[PDB]
Amino acid sequence: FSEEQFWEACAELQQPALAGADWQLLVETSGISIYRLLDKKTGLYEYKVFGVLEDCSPTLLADIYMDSDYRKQWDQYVKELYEQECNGETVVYWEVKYPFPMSNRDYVYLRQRRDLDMEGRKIHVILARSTSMPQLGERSGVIRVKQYKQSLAIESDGKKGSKVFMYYFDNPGGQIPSWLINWAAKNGVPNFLKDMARACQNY
Ligand SMILES: CCCCC/C=C\C/C=C\CCCCCCCC(=O)OC[C@H](COP(=O)([O-])OCC[N+](C)(C)C)OC(=O)CCCCCCC/C=C\C/C=C\CCCCC
């Protein structure tokens, strides 16, 4: 994870670039919006998350975004989650619960935080990216997501919470039913952001 990449995760935090392509909104909740951009040739999507979360310190949100022990405790979709050091870098293992019949997806990835000061503005950036380890091969029954990259930026909203900007992408290695995106858009994520807000109140 280079310097530049961290800097790059701050751009849309101030100003949302979405005009270059067909980003369509998909969700608005708790003052958070999710845009998605379909890659017509692969059926694959990219997501962008903007918004605010009052009632949750930028600095809280960051620490919690990093706390696996805690995440395992409050996040209902985590089936398994743990960290190990490999070389000098932290490697995260995360298995996500999928609505059966669908098999869960699990991730092996590098995750790194950096609290920045961009012109006196104190921001928090976390980038994630896929990696592989010979000791951690694929598990039968679970779908290993081999392509995954994410970035997230947290600034205060000046008031009680924090404004964020998240960029997301992975190849779930199998079709994702529209119904699941519909459950996700309309109930899944809305309820998540809530438990998370609430999990932030009880740190
Ligand atoms: C809004 C419209 C919905 C769009 C469709 C989304 C998903 C459809 C595909 C599969 C859904 C199956 C059910 C899974 C439960 C989803 C409920 C939820 O809502 O699960 C939050 C969570 C954020 O994962 P994570 O970033 O915490 O770490 C993630 C690390 N690993 C990637 C390794 C897991 O979703 C995930 O993993 C799944 C990957 C999708 C993430 C893309 C949008 C992000 C949605 C919510 C996050 C937005 C704001 C909160 C984030 C912090 C605020 C600064």
d(CA 67, CA 70): 5
Calculate the alpha carbon distances from 131 to 92, 136, 153 in Å: 9, 10, 22
DSSP string, 46-94: EEEEEEEETTS-HHHHHHHHH-HHHHHHH-TTEEEEEEEEETTEEEEEE
Evaluate: CB of 60 within 6 angstroms of ligand 1: no
Distance 119 CA to ligand 1 centre (A): 30
Distance 188 CA to ligand 1 centre (A): 9
d(CA 152, CA 185): 19
Q: Which residues pair with 155 in a beta bridge?
A: 163
**Candidate from 56, 75, 96 with most ligand 1 atoms within 8 A of CB, to mutate:** 96
Calculate the alpha carbon distances from 29 to 36, 150, 187, 199 in Å: 15, 21, 10, 17
Listed residue (111, 172, 174, 112) closest to 146, CA to CA: 172
Q: Which residues contact 163 (CB under 8 A, 6 or more apart)?
A: 13, 50, 51, 52, 154, 155, 156, 157
Q: Which residues contact 147 (CB under 8 A, 6 or more apart)?
A: 130, 169, 170, 171
Q: Which residues pair with 164 in a beta bridge?
A: 51, 154
Q: Which residue range(s) make up the domain with 20? A: 1-203
Distance 96 CA to ligand 1 centre (A): 10
**Candidate from 52, 64, 71, 192 with most ligand 1 atoms within 8 A of CB, to mutate:** 192
Listed residue (126, 130, 115) closest to 152, CA to CA: 126
Q: How many CA atoms lie within 13 A of 104 on its CB side?
A: 15
Calculate the alpha carbon distances from 58 to 93, 109, 123, 159, 195 in Å: 25, 24, 8, 11, 17
With beta carbons less than 8 A apart as the criterion, state whether 145 and 139 touch.
no
What crossing angle do the helices spanning 58-66 and 189-201 adopt, rounded to 10°?
A: 110
Domain count, the chain: 1
Q: Which residues pair with 132 in a beta bridge?
A: none
CATH code of the domain in which 129 resides: 3.30.530.20
Resolution (A): 2.4
Q: Which residues are annotated as a binding site for a 1,2-diacyl-sn-glycero-3-phosphocholine?
A: 65, 71, 150
Four-CA torsion 172, 9, 56, 26, nearest 10 degrees: -50
